[PDB]
Design an enzyme around this catalytic site. Structure first.
Site, PDB file in Angstrom:
ATOM      1  N   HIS A  65       0.776  -1.255   0.000  1.00  0.00           N
ATOM      2  CA  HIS A  65       0.000   0.000   0.000  1.00  0.00           C
ATOM      3  C   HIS A  65       0.806   1.304   0.000  1.00  0.00           C
ATOM      4  O   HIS A  65       1.866   1.402   0.628  1.00  0.00           O
ATOM      5  CB  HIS A  65      -0.942   0.035   1.207  1.00  0.00           C
ATOM      6  CG  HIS A  65      -1.959  -1.062   1.211  1.00  0.00           C
ATOM      7  ND1 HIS A  65      -2.467  -1.600   2.375  1.00  0.00           N
ATOM      8  CD2 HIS A  65      -2.547  -1.736   0.196  1.00  0.00           C
ATOM      9  CE1 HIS A  65      -3.329  -2.555   2.074  1.00  0.00           C
ATOM     10  NE2 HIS A  65      -3.398  -2.655   0.758  1.00  0.00           N
ATOM     11  N   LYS A  74       5.189   6.252   7.562  1.00  0.00           N
ATOM     12  CA  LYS A  74       4.576   5.293   8.484  1.00  0.00           C
ATOM     13  C   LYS A  74       5.605   4.760   9.489  1.00  0.00           C
ATOM     14  O   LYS A  74       6.705   4.361   9.099  1.00  0.00           O
ATOM     15  CB  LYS A  74       3.949   4.124   7.710  1.00  0.00           C
ATOM     16  CG  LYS A  74       2.732   4.477   6.855  1.00  0.00           C
ATOM     17  CD  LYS A  74       2.392   3.344   5.896  1.00  0.00           C
ATOM     18  CE  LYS A  74       1.253   3.700   4.967  1.00  0.00           C
ATOM     19  NZ  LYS A  74       1.031   2.646   3.924  1.00  0.00           N
ATOM     20  N   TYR A 134       0.120   1.396  13.681  1.00  0.00           N
ATOM     21  CA  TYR A 134       1.004   2.369  13.043  1.00  0.00           C
ATOM     22  C   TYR A 134       0.532   3.818  13.035  1.00  0.00           C
ATOM     23  O   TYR A 134      -0.662   4.103  13.099  1.00  0.00           O
ATOM     24  CB  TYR A 134       1.381   1.923  11.635  1.00  0.00           C
ATOM     25  CG  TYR A 134       0.273   1.873  10.607  1.00  0.00           C
ATOM     26  CD1 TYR A 134       0.194   2.839   9.606  1.00  0.00           C
ATOM     27  CD2 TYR A 134      -0.645   0.835  10.590  1.00  0.00           C
ATOM     28  CE1 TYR A 134      -0.795   2.793   8.638  1.00  0.00           C
ATOM     29  CE2 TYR A 134      -1.643   0.778   9.623  1.00  0.00           C
ATOM     30  CZ  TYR A 134      -1.703   1.760   8.641  1.00  0.00           C
ATOM     31  OH  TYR A 134      -2.685   1.725   7.672  1.00  0.00           O
TER      32      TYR A 134
HETATM   33  C1  LIG Z   1      -6.663   2.732   5.900  1.00  0.00           C
HETATM   34  C2  LIG Z   1      -7.969   3.158   6.525  1.00  0.00           C
HETATM   35  C3  LIG Z   1      -9.115   2.389   6.353  1.00  0.00           C
HETATM   36  N1  LIG Z   1     -10.284   2.771   6.899  1.00  0.00           N
HETATM   37  C4  LIG Z   1     -11.470   1.923   6.711  1.00  0.00           C
HETATM   38  C5  LIG Z   1     -11.866   1.649   5.264  1.00  0.00           C
HETATM   39  C6  LIG Z   1     -12.388   0.227   5.325  1.00  0.00           C
HETATM   40  O1  LIG Z   1     -13.798   0.266   5.564  1.00  0.00           O
HETATM   41  C7  LIG Z   1     -11.692  -0.417   6.513  1.00  0.00           C
HETATM   42  C8  LIG Z   1     -10.552  -1.363   6.147  1.00  0.00           C
HETATM   43  O2  LIG Z   1      -9.714  -0.800   5.133  1.00  0.00           O
HETATM   44  P1  LIG Z   1      -9.240  -1.677   3.870  1.00  0.00           P
HETATM   45  O3  LIG Z   1      -8.173  -2.621   4.346  1.00  0.00           O
HETATM   46  O4  LIG Z   1      -8.947  -0.737   2.723  1.00  0.00           O
HETATM   47  O5  LIG Z   1     -10.597  -2.525   3.628  1.00  0.00           O
HETATM   48  P2  LIG Z   1     -11.292  -2.928   2.228  1.00  0.00           P
HETATM   49  O6  LIG Z   1     -10.376  -3.990   1.661  1.00  0.00           O
HETATM   50  O7  LIG Z   1     -12.654  -3.426   2.654  1.00  0.00           O
HETATM   51  O8  LIG Z   1     -11.373  -1.630   1.453  1.00  0.00           O
HETATM   52  O9  LIG Z   1     -11.166   0.655   7.294  1.00  0.00           O
HETATM   53  C9  LIG Z   1     -10.364   3.945   7.696  1.00  0.00           C
HETATM   54  O10 LIG Z   1     -11.455   4.299   8.220  1.00  0.00           O
HETATM   55  N2  LIG Z   1      -9.267   4.699   7.892  1.00  0.00           N
HETATM   56  C10 LIG Z   1      -8.082   4.386   7.353  1.00  0.00           C
HETATM   57  O11 LIG Z   1      -7.099   5.119   7.559  1.00  0.00           O
END
Ligand SMILES: Cc1cn([C@H]2C[C@H](O)[C@@H](COP(=O)(O)OP(=O)(O)O)O2)c(=O)[nH]c1=O
Ligand SMILES: Cc1cn([C@H]2C[C@H](O)[C@@H](COP(=O)(O)OP(=O)(O)O)O2)c(=O)[nH]c1=O
Lengths: 184, 184
Positions: A65, A74, A134
């Protein structure tokens, strides 16, 4: 009469940190982050605006990512279990463009990796469960999120896996390094 | 719809936070801190400079702690186990001077308390072990550290503990509220 340790890795802008831990009759205490000490080690000011917390089962892989705009430096660690953590240099102008470094981070060893803007990041869970914390230098921006697929044949990352990894769909659908948006 | 929750307690400068947790078949993800969302909830800017991490066995009680110069605001939470967490108003001029509030914080409920500069802080461990994380607005300064004894008869804190707590020598030797250095 010991102290925090900081070690620059083979890609020098990535730094491995190890806190000084104090044990006693209650349990333990350590500073997991200190702005002054951190900035002295890095060589410049860094400010964090968001802390994230995930829990993952054995064999789960999250990554690779990065945010191509509103980029996030990070500082990462593991507070339960054990992961193999990876940083990939995506700066086209860098002498280590397309190289990666990796380290084992665990609740037990208390090691952390600082991974500046310009890199992609990912980890795989080696224990039954792991919890991964993190700190980020900028806010979540879903529109700017990008992904490179874990097993890209040019990066040749050697993940310690026994069977197939457990991936989200977005991560399963990551792009090839050769097709990927990179930094200057 | 679901989102982060923030609730001012009986001493209104103390805020109880609860993150929104996203679950999937890998485990979960949440933001344990977001500076925008936090500053909006408390009504003013904040800067954290240190993150601390402790591990404590059942019955351990740490407190009641504050720094009289270089005073630290604290945002606290539990990542393993369960504690009862307490905030005491030590601002002599405040209308709630000598009052306290308390809440149970656990890894599972994910609740957090924001305890501003001017308060004393303590917690007791209710689980086999507890791991407790906190962010501070200023650096550790041992010359300015002060302690009030846990069972002061004027504060009358109702610790939900069965048998006697395990304390460090420092905390056993805490001053009485009547004799303690307080803020103006
Ligand atoms: C990275 C990140 C994700 N999220 C949310 C988005 C997703 O609903 C969940 C998990 O992220 P993610 O791993 O991108 O899930 P998905 O594969 O379902 O898109 O957390 C935040 O609210 N804040 C953040 O900084
Ligand atoms: C609170 C704090 C303690 N420490 C150190 C001081 C102590 O050597 C150790 C434990 O803290 P403390 O409980 O204050 O000392 P003691 O165990 O003697 O009562 O951690 C830090 O390095 N940074 C901090 O922010």
């Amino acid at each position: 009469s010991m102290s925090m340790k900081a070690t620059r890795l083979a890609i020098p802008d990535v730094i491995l940190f190890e806190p000084r831990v104090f044990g006693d009759d209650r349990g333990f205490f350590f500073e997991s982050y200190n702005q002054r000490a951190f900035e002295e080690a890095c060589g410049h000011p860094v400010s964090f605006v968001q802390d994230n917390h995930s829990r993952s089962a054995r064999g789960v892989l999250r990554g690779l990512h990065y945010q191509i705009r509103q980029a996030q430096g990070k500082l990462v660690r593991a507070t339960l279990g054990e992961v193999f953590d990876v940083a990939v240099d995506l700066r086209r102008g860098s002498p280590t463009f397309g190289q990666w470094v990796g380290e084992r981070l665990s609740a037990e060893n208390k090691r952390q990796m600082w991974i500046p803007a310009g890199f992609a990041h990912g980890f795989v869970v080696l224990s039954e469960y792991a919890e991964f914390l993190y700190k980020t230098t900028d806010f979540w921006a879903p529109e700017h999120e990008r992904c490179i697929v874990w097993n890209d044949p040019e990066l040749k990352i050697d993940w310690p896996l026994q069977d197939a990894p457990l991936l989200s769909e977005k991560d399963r659908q990551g792009k090839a390094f050769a097709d990927a948006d990179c930094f200057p």
